[PDB]
Ligand binder design. Structure first.
Ligand SMILES: Cc1cc(=O)n(C)c2cc(N3C(=O)CC[C@H](NS(=O)(=O)CC(C)C)[C@H]3c3ccc(Cl)cc3)ccc12
Ligand SMILES: Cc1cc(=O)n(C)c2cc(N3C(=O)CC[C@H](NS(=O)(=O)CC(C)C)[C@H]3c3ccc(Cl)cc3)ccc12
Lengths: 113, 113
């Protein structure tokens, strides 16, 4: 492993701690969510993101954040706002934006300087 | 845990992997290393470094790197060059210097955007 990979694993672990049921742990299938494939063409989940970190496919935090936002956006797109899935996705979306904001990334940069 | 703590735990883990017998895992006593405290006025070891990470006593990678360097220097000052201790400290020093170089850290900071 590498430093960028460890920081992204950290951010991932912190986000996944907010999903203790594991709603977003693994890909949604049509078996569990009828019509999911019809509505969601760009699927994402925390397991996939973990595999992508391990293969070093994220070249920046911006790239990692985009997949994270995509996962949350898919949950809010397929599910209606009165479901546990939508509500949690909105919450964790906010937490991730705060955790990985410019201001936060700047303080971390200081500690590498 | 914080992002800096996680980064430092990564560097520490990678360096300890190079010391499977734990030569540097805990403080050297004078019973095991006669006269050590006469030669070495600022002891350091991987166990202490871990405790400092946990206690949040590193302001930067520079500070951590300085403890690692101190650990290696102590080994290379006290022990004779034909010893396992000297030779392993030198090997580990070089590996650490490669892993925590300014160049590596600039690259890592670029990826935090
Ligand atoms: C209908 C539906 C939509 C949706 O967007 N998500 C994220 C769901 C997640 C569901 N899951 C749960 O409600 C409980 C956790 C479960 N994840 S898990 O099986 O990997 C077990 C966890 C402890 C690791 C998740 C889920 C996700 C995919 C599938 Cl195929 C089944 C259930 C079920 C339905 C949906
Ligand atoms: C003589 C000597 C000098 C020195 O600089 N070092 C680092 C030493 C390390 C020594 N140790 C070993 O040779 C084997 C490992 C041992 N570390 S450990 O007790 O923590 C075993 C581990 C698997 C948990 C190490 C050592 C370090 C501290 C002490 Cl007090 C005794 C032995 C022994 C002698 C010296």
């Amino acid at each position: 492993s590498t430093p960028i990979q460890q920081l992204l694993e950290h951010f991932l672990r912190q986000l996944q701690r907010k999903d203790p049921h594991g709603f977003f742990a693994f890909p949604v299938t049509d078996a569990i969510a009828p019509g999911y494939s019809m509505i969601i063409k760009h699927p994402m989940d925390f397991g996939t993101m973990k595999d992508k970190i391990v293969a070093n496919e994220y070249k920046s935090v911006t790239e990692f954040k985009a997949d994270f936002k995509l996962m949350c956006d898919n949950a809010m797109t397929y599910n209606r706002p009165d479901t546990v899935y939508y509500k949690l996705a909105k919450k964790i979306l906010h937490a991730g934006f705060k955790m990985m904001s410019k201001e936060r990334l700047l303080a971390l940069k200081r500690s590498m300087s």
